[PDB]
Subunit: 150 residues, 6 copies
């Protein structure tokens, strides 16, 4: 359905490099609707929860400390296949390997400084959206441009 949501986050580097506007603008242009938005400096528990799957990985520590090293603008976009689409718009883990046209392909160079993060699955999305947003911070009844869906 056209009510599928995803969690996206302009990481501390993207925020610091002033990419928030550019990133939100790209998602709005593709037609996805913003249903949650806020700037915050992630807490250590939020970062370790958000990235729980890499808790065993070696970069985990440097990932968590970085994600909490500055303000992040967490957001949730809604729309048909948004989880997979948003990812496509993001690129690949390594911005060098990311194709021009994609967010990381256009703005990134380092894997640890890859501007933005997004859910990799609908299941990861629903969980992460609940980690970073309270139900009341999320739009309930949505209305995208009627020229977006059949």
């Amino acid at each position: 359905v056209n009510k599928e949501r995803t969690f996206l986050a302009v990481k501390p580097d993207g925020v610091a490099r002033g990419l928030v506007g550019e990133i939100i603008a790209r998602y709005e242009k593709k037609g996805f609707v913003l249903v949650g938005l806020k700037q915050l400096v992630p807490t250590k528990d939020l970062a370790e929860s958000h990235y729980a799957e890499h808790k065993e990985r070696p970069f985990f520590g440097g990932l968590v400390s970085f994600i909490t090293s500055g303000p992040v603008v967490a957001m949730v976009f809604e729309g048909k296949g948004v989880v997979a689409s948003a990812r496509l718009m993001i690129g690949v883990t390594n911005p060098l390997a990311s194709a021009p046209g994609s967010i990381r392909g256009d703005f990134g160079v380092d894997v640890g400084r890859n501007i933005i993060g997004g859910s990799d699955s609908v299941e990861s999305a629903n969980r992460e959206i609940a980690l970073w947003f309270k139900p009341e911070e999320l739009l309930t009844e949505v209305k995208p441009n009627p020229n977006l869906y059949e």
Copy 2:
């Protein structure tokens, strides 16, 4: 040669979503010469003729209603490899699968609302071009930036 032409059309949704100029500019920048251009509200006939290959397809009815539910800015661009290039610049049938950087990859989400249509071959182009444009509506004197061709 560089006299090749393709037919392109900003669908009612692309027009309504304010993407007409966005689309024309992308072809102008690539170096294709706009040889014909007009805004029309397609008739059922033109649309059914245009999409005659999908006439037995389940989506035909909804498409023919869509394409004729409002304005369409039909255009013809000329240049070397234009038909295949234009398509590459458009993306894929499903906008969601279309890569960032391509028109549908940047602006679409629904297959029925895929912003733009273009010829899939020189044979298709020649028939669609003659389908939407009268000879007098297409330039004879075409000359692109001299820095475009060797």
Copy 3:
């Protein structure tokens, strides 16, 4: 109601400089709806009546000849104060004196090559509109983004 319409034309230089999509995009972004659009090579007769008010001025001859030199994409945008707004967005007759942000202020240098033309009054909008477009080439059913008007 705000169904006011203005006539605009990307002159041969603007068309040749590949700024058609750019100009159209600026008016689409503003909120104006395209109710007419076409590319033609203006006839000395249309050019002459178009600029009938300058028929006595010394630049007339070179002007009529310029506008008729090549393709022009004529268009009519409808909207609340579109005549005066479109002009503001154009700049001044002298591209150099046109402020940055305006079409001529961003893309022009010479007065004879000022990229775009537009009606200076509703009186002239209606006159020039009726000059370049047949009623059947213009939209009856005009519907802009509902977030544009109160």
Copy 4:
């Protein structure tokens, strides 16, 4: 000082027209730092408080009901003379009168649908920032690009 803040808000129309990204991007580009950000549907009391100065004005009722008619993304930018600068970037109350280059000059047409709102004074800014944001939702220790200030 370079720690001056202002309250800005992409109104329901700007949000609905997908201008959030574009607006935030303009402020980030001028060099102002984001110190507060969130999407919410203003409450009636928030709107009437925010616009308390027009409570006696005739448009007040339609202004309040509109501002609360949809989600708004309230934000606070910090920087040297940001209150006056942000306004300059906004334009004038009437988007038609707003110069090209400014937010309303580029995107608006109606006074009731003027895309964005911002503080008109440092004193109005500090109050409004407190109406829409809790101290904990605002960045305390700020760090803009060091190439921004002397």
Copy 5:
């Protein structure tokens, strides 16, 4: 005539803030022909010579340190009314007072960090051009888009 030249310089902050291409593109679009271009870290002399008119001014010392604290991409654009046009496109000394659409109006906040510098007169231009460029670093064969001049 259209052989006039002005000297422009993306200051260390503009360079560091990643605005070099942004600036060059704006002059290319306006129709000015880049006649010389290089990236250099200005010497105290070049800078003190360059800003000799402010040598007794309180801000001279801090300016001469700034302008020489990193790379500067000095350039010379040629074209009709270029010196006055370039300045118009730049804005005013104080970026905060510079209107949206102009370079400083869009990207600056501090007077000491005003992104770009340009000649204020043909006499100033001719001296600054000869100050930063050797004759062999400037084109002799200049030819702009033929759609630029009558």
Copy 6:
């Protein structure tokens, strides 16, 4: 460390088509720092050694003559994987086969007029860099946005 450098050149067609700022902006946006930059009219000798590897190929003659036809803005960008990344951002030798989002995929059509040139390896980067730039024309002190690298 990520001080890898590549040589890039907006060819005579790219320069003539006014795409210098656009190209530079795309690399500045990515995070690469310009450690060298100049506009010159390549000499047959430099052009010939530059393309020494194609000295036997049949297109050589017209190539050497083209690159030397007019101004070229040579540049060297430094950064993590800049050689391979810059290439990815360029597209493929054939502009038409170059994907949208890439420089050639967005602006080119002919193989002889492919807007931009760039090193295909660190070996060639270092060779071509030493070919077009004197050590004193290149930066020693390179400092990119600290949010770029870990």
